[PDB]
A paper describes a structure:
The β‐barrel assembly machinery (BAM complex) is essential for outer membrane protein (OMP) folding in Gram‐negative bacteria, and represents a promising antimicrobial target. BAM is thought to exist in two major conformations, defined by closing (lateral‐closed) or opening (lateral‐open) of a membrane‐facing gate in the core component BamA, itself an OMP. Transitioning between lateral open and closed states is proposed to be essential for BAM function, with multiple antimicrobials shown to bias the conformational equilibrium in vitro. In X‐ray and cryoEM structures, opening of BAM's lateral‐gate leads to an outward swinging motion of the six N‐terminal β‐strands of the barrel relative to the ten C‐terminal strands and their connecting loops.
As no structure of DAR‐B bound to the complete BAM complex has been reported, we also solved cryoEM structures of wild‐type BAM (BAM‐WT) in n‐dodecyl‐β‐D‐maltoside (DDM) micelles in the presence or absence of DAR‐B, reaching resolutions of 3.3 Å (+DAR‐B) and 3.5 Å (−DAR‐B). However, in the BAM‐WT : DAR‐B complex, binding of DAR‐B to β1 of BamA stabilises the lateral‐closed state. DAR‐B therefore promotes a transition to the lateral‐closed conformation in vitro, as observed for equivalent BAM structures (in detergent micelles) bound to the darobactin variants DAR‐A and DAR‐9. DAR‐B formed a similar binding interface to β1 of BAM to that previously observed for DAR‐B bound to BamA alone (X‐ray crystal structure) or DAR‐A bound to the intact BAM complex (cryoEM structure). We show that the antibiotic darobactin B (DAR‐B), a homologue of DAR‐A, also binds in the lateral‐closed state in vitro and induces closure of the BAM lateral gate in vivo, showcasing the biological relevance of its mechanism of action in a cellular context. Predicted distance distributions for the L501R1‐S755R1 pair in the BAM‐WT : DAR‐B cryoEM structure were generated using MtsslWizard. Strikingly, these distributions showed an excellent agreement with the experimentally obtained PELDOR distribution of this complex, consistent with DAR‐B binding causing the BamA gate to lock shut in a lateral‐closed state in the intact BAM complex in the OM. Collectively, our PELDOR and cryoEM data are consistent with DAR‐B inducing a lateral‐closed state of BAM in vivo, indicating that its mode of action in the native cellular environment mirrors that observed in vitro. By contrast, addition of the bactericidal agent, DAR‐B causes a switch to a more homogeneous ensemble, consistent with the lateral‐closed conformation, providing direct proof of its mode of antimicrobial action in cells.
Residue numbers in the entry:
A (entry chain D): 24 to 242
B (entry chain G): 1 to 7
C (entry chain B): 29 to 392
D (entry chain C): 30 to 87
E (entry chain E): 27 to 111
F (entry chain A): 24 to 808
The structure:
Amino acid sequence: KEEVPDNPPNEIYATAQQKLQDGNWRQAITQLEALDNRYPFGPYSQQVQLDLIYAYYKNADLPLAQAAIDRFIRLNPTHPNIDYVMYMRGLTNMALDDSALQGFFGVDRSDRDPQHARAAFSDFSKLVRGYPNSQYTTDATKRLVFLKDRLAKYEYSVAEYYTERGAWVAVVNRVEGMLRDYPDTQATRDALPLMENAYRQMQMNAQAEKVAKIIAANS
Amino acid sequence: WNWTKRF
Amino acid sequence: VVKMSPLPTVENQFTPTTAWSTSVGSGIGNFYSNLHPALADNVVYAADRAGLVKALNADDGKEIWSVSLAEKDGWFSKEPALLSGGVTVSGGHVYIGSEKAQVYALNTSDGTVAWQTKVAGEALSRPVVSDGLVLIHTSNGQLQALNEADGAVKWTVNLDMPSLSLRGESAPTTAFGAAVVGGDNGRVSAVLMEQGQMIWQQRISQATGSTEIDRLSDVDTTPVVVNGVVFALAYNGNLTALDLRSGQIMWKRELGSVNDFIVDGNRIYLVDQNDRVMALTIDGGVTLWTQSDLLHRLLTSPVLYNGNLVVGDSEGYLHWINVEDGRFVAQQKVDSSGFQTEPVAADGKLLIQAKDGTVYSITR
Amino acid sequence: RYKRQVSGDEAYLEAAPLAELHAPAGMILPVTSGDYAIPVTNGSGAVGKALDIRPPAQ
Amino acid sequence: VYRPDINQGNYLTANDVSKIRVGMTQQQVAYALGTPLMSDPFGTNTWFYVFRQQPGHEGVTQQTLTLTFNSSGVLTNIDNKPALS
Amino acid sequence: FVVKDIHFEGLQRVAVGAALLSMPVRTGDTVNDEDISNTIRALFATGNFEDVRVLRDGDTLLVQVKERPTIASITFSGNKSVKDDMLKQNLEASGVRVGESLDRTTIADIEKGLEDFYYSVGKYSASVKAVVTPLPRNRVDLKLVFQEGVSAEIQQINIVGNHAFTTDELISHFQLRDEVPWWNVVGDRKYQKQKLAGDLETLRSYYLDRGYARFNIDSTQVSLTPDKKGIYVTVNITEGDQYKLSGVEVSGNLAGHSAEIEQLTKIEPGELYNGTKVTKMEDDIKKLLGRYGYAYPRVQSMPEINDADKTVKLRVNVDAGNRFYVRKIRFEGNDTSKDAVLRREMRQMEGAWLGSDLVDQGKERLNRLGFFETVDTDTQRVPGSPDQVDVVYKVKERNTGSFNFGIGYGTESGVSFQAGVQQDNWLGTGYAVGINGTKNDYQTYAELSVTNPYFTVDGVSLGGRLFYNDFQADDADLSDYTNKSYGTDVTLGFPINEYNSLRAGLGYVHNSLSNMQPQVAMWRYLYSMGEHPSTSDQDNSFKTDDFTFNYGWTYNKLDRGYFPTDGSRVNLTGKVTIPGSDNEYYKVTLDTATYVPIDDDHKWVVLGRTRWGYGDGLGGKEMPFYENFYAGGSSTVRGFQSNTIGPKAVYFPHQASNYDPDYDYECATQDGAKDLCKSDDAVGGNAMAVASLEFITPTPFISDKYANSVRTSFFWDMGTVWDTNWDSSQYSGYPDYSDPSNIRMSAGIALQWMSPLGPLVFSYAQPFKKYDGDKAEQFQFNIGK
């Protein structure tokens, strides 16, 4: 089990590529790991490391992947195709954020831990800034938009909960924060009424009138 | 006796 | 786990036989204690963990008297006295230690308690009488000297105590008004009888490396003085010869143990941690003969009897070996419960005790 | 397990496009601080499941 | 216990509120009372030291304290009410 | 000589440029022997190579470097007590991991740490060997082989210099034990370090609670036997005298609240100096200061001891800090459970002043949730702010689903089987869904329940439950009748306080009775309902559907969940069938327990059990005969057979469908019955009253060690069950079952303890006041789940 035959490294690379194109990711991961641990820093160790990253992603071994990209970016910080490496890091974080104990069935998981979303957003932002003319920039921007919307939705969810309980100052502060940090997202449009209601309930009307005007302007 | 196994 | 070596297939020439076998109050059970019988004036004094002390006849083991030192408030309340300090019948009186910091002193005739005293801590070391005083080496890193008449605390001396030690305290030995003792710390120290005046202190510990728990923590067993030269041992340490006047190292051997050793003529017989009995030369510890058939059998301190070395073992077999060459001379089974504490040999009589407390007198 | 197998194929390109909140006269919404501001750039590849993530040839 | 004791806003001890006066700089007011939990973000220097408090089922009691700061970073008018009204 | 090139022979890991720049030398610079030695030393100090050898090949320095081998793999064999995952993690902590350079020196410290760990696990004599197997291209296979030897255990926990308290009474409360009986779960004898400090702290607290203000542990010595399988722990202490509380004075910066603080710190004259009560008063002062809006109040209670009159004076210094405001609460690690499931257990509200006790309260609620294995808190500061903080919570998600299968024994249940599968967090949304099943000697039960513990933000629970219940009254020591039923109930739960809870809900139950035994009371119920079956027939059939409104109230205040010593517990349940159902009746039950302590240590206790119950039909109908109360057995009154107490069945002259010679078959005409005949078959009345006075005392014949793990008591029980609706003077030849005066009594001795097999409860009883017809049972034993 998980034992690769002792063959020349080129043969290992060939079988790895064949199994990668076939679809069986676990066997390719085993072959790449055997190749890497059998020839420490071999003639084409960089290609082996990149194949390891890709196979770890495909198998959905996200933490082991994350470790692989960490070690690679530590080793070589100027590899021509490092942009692909940062894209892979962003995809790893986004995937980690997208987890499911039982499965993905539209629960929308928008009020779970968002740290992975923030990390993915940061990585994609750095990628798009560094290499505006990369092949992965369009996907980076689209994923950035998606992550921004998800974070705004999380903030709106917290505001909704504190509106349910009745911590009006907390609701006002949370909605103001999500207004400062995610003005463009649609969650702000649905969250502003919560802030207006919170202002109304604390016997404050001037700010309530201002928020009502804000809501009236955009609709 | 009582046995529980948290799967 | 190191395996217990099998018993020896040796034909005995003389068959050991028990002159008499008496029973005591369950013995020391499984606990590691120094309680052993003591023969004096043809009388055998024995004790037990529960708090029962008996004086019996040496010739045939008839009961002369018995007293239960355990306290009891009524017919329902009774706590054990936890006697774990051996017996040192000498110059009259009977001194017994305890794990409750008590030193019981009884009378030889009938056993009425002569006096009682409170000590610094647990008193495991065998009390030693000398110059009208009784020395008790406690497990609390203290050495107390009490009066032999009224049982008052004459003086105390403080010795360092490591964090992790071996469950045993060395018995001080006295000569020419100086008592030498080895504490749990790897240092042999000599003090004066009149008061707690330190004369010299020499370390004989070996292999002080490694920084862990259960390190090479050396512990002294029983220094012995002869012709102005002290001989000391230490668990995982070095069998060392020291000068009494200044505690200067004379010669060392890289072997250690916790069981006592015997010095006879010009031969030092001892047993190592791995349960190997051997004899060394007094001059420079020159190995002469070795016997390793009883490896890891938890043998007791050896005893000299008619020029033969007698040793008990955990499984309950007593082995007699020839001192001259180290070859087995006889093997006997005396008790199934096993032998843990040291035996005694005096007035041509050999007495031993087992974990069940049974007292056995071995003819030969 | 497959706790992350679904993420092998993600898609989800249908998020509603972002739109800025218009400021009514007489007040200004607080400064954005640009912490999460998304830069405007256009890449050379595709987005909708067509772009490949295979390693680059060396 | 049904609902716990819900507290919101800054804590105005009813004594330090009298400590403030017209003419103190923002730093001095913050020192006297403390940084406000909420403030007006729509381009106007105004602090709200709301002291909403609810001891469970007893009933919400609030003491609003509007501290408006002029364009020069100093107080212009203290207003406050101790009842919801 | 001058240098112009470095070979870097055998450099596959470290880049040539990196190695070149690592050394403090540049090409084209004069190089001497001292310079060569300095470069070699610097390269060695980089921590990347194991050997450096430089050769002067021509005019260029041939720098042959033995590179640090990479960890090809680490192999462990013989770790039967420790899983290799923890060894892997420990290796990771030291930097030794597969795919990392092996320095050949730090591995020595790693194996030292492993040996220390084995010592910590109780394997003292074990041996560890970190063998290295070379592999091509300068690879290393790290074989961490070892022999675990044999574990050590504690042999004696001895305390010296103690008086007025035996060693047994003192080493009992220790988490560290020395005598662990097989027949009683008390713990292991494995020795630890932190546990020893905890036990010394427990000893300190036990001595300080009793007034010994001068208690001080002189020292503590741990020893090992030469065989290395026995620990010996000794604790040398020095106990003082019993002091008394002279008075307490509060001083410091009280924030202008001296009156309330003084009121809280009040003491009766000449009270005993209790450290626990002193700390409770300190925490009460802390709570008072925090409630007014102080985040970090400080209370330092120093006792001044005057031996002249043996008195202690408490000087308590109070110092209220500043005010902090929580800007926002964050939760980290909850990848599955949504934010609401965690942020509704928080007693601290975001956007409000800070209270540390509130944060710890919320922490304990999150711990009691059960979803999280570990939950840590961090009151982090807001950058660039004087008095604003964020209260972060870091949680490590635990598994929730679990299936269990238990089996038990008893005299009232024969052998009981139980199984089920539960999910206490459905997709991380708080909903709990479970399937349960039980098979008794006389009944079977299958249940499927789904509950939302937070239906309203306040904490009102809403649950639903579907059940299928089969009852075989023949096996339950009762008149023969089978009852198969199924139903569904939906309930709401309102919590008032921490010691009260109301439940109110609706339910629908469909019952089907079959194989019913012709008897007077059952036929009366059937006649009232509207059906008149033939007494001769033995095989009958009936079925009904009912809608019921259920209400209940439970008040629980027991100090300890297991083996209580103090507190009350009152349960009151009731139900009424709503109009529009076949049956028309109501029922109510009320069971009470009360443990009152009589001594100071809560060792001698009095338990006042009581149980009332009454039910009746509303209109002309009758309360169903399959819902009447019961008595006797082990639960209600010991010393009687299960269900025996109460009215007995009166049989009609019926012929059994199946008959065998010499068998009664319930006074069947087949046997020869031709008229009403009374029997000993209990039927169960509709009014029950039971009481029981029990005295709990410490078990006499047992070592004072683990003497609190067995509960022994003497009980006196009274009971009576009667049928109110039994027709008056219906027959002069049978006892007036409707008379409630008939009261049965019994007295006996009971024992309980937690065996490894489960909770065992033995009882021996004598029913000295049993009435005619009651079946007598004496030795009632129950082997819990």
